[PDB]
Amino acid sequence: PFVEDWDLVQTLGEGAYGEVQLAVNRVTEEAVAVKIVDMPENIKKEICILKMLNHENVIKFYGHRREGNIQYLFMELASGGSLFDRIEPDIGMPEPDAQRFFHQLMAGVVYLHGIGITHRDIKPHNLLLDERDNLKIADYSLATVFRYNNRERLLNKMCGTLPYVAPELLKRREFHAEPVDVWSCGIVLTAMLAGELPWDQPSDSCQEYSDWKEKKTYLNPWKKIDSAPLALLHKILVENPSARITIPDIKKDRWYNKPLKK
Numbered sequence: 001p002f003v004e005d006w007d008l009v010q011t012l013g014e015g016a017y018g019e020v021q022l023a024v025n026r027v028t029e030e031a032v033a034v035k036i037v038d039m040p041e042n043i044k045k046e047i048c049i050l051k052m053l054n055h056e057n058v059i060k061f062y063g064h065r066r067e068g069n070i071q072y073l074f075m076e077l078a079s080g081g082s083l084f085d086r087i088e089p090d091i092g093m094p095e096p097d098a099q100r101f102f103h104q105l106m107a108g109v110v111y112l113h114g115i116g117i118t119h120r121d122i123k124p125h126n127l128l129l130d131e132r133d134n135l136k137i138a139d140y141s142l143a144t145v146f147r148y149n150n151r152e153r154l155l156n157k158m159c160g161t162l163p164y165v166a167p168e169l170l171k172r173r174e175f176h177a178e179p180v181d182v183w184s185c186g187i188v189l190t191a192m193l194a195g196e197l198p199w200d201q202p203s204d205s206c207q208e209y210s211d212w213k214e215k216k217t218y219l220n221p222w223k224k225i226d227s228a229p230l231a232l233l234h235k236i237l238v239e240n241p242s243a244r245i246t247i248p249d250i251k252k253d254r255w256y257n258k259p260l261k262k
């Protein structure tokens, strides 16, 4: 296909609304990723949020075009793929790689939270890598504003991916945005270090979640995780969101500051 001055060659992925494709300009040869959305006030909010974004660990937004019903969203091609494709099932990845990726994910989540934006769907599929293996947070179709004019807005909409969602989304009418994003980062850490998700959903009906609350760390995936990162996970994966660790305090954690290599 050809649109204006681009050639949509490779399918990079697909979401609820539309799909992402590779667009190499027939004139300049610049490689970008285009989100082609067929057909509400949700695309107005997405293009808006994307404009506000300027950070090394957040996907580059270039602009937006149109073709009647079909919308075109311009984004940086993350030429290194996704974090999901770097996690080996039942194993994970070397702990020094996991720590570096977790530092870069915290740098991205701090930035988004500082501009009053919550991603709302942090998981390995949304965490892309560039040429140098720099982590970039992608896909703002569920991103909402949680702070405006220094005033915090509580959330009520349930969204995300069940294995990554915090328990307060399923139990409470309204909840704070930042702890929900912190919880999903801990599930991403658990995935990087054990190549396995701890539970289907964080509910009182789910046995693997009950086991974690009963402190049974002698079970998988926890037994594949060293005591230092596991101590951090005990602070991130706390049910009551008011007792959960904040990002400034994750920055003071022993494993987060532990020198690693090889």
Ligand SMILES: Cn1cc([C@H]2C[C@@H]2C(=O)Nc2cc3cc(C4CCN([C@]5(C)COC[C@@H]5O)CC4)c(Cl)cc3cn2)cn1
Residues within 6 Å of the ligand: 012, 013, 014, 015, 016, 020, 033, 035, 075, 076, 077, 078, 079, 080, 081, 082, 125, 126, 128, 138, 139
């Ligand atoms: C030089 N070279 C590069 C390659 C390709 C490997 C490189 C790649 O895939 N890059 C890439 C991929 C991108 C994917 C997305 C989307 C994220 C979100 N998912 C989901 C909706 C979430 O969960 C389920 C769905 O996977 C859809 C896709 C976006 Cl927004 C931007 C992207 C930019 N760049 C080959 N040669």
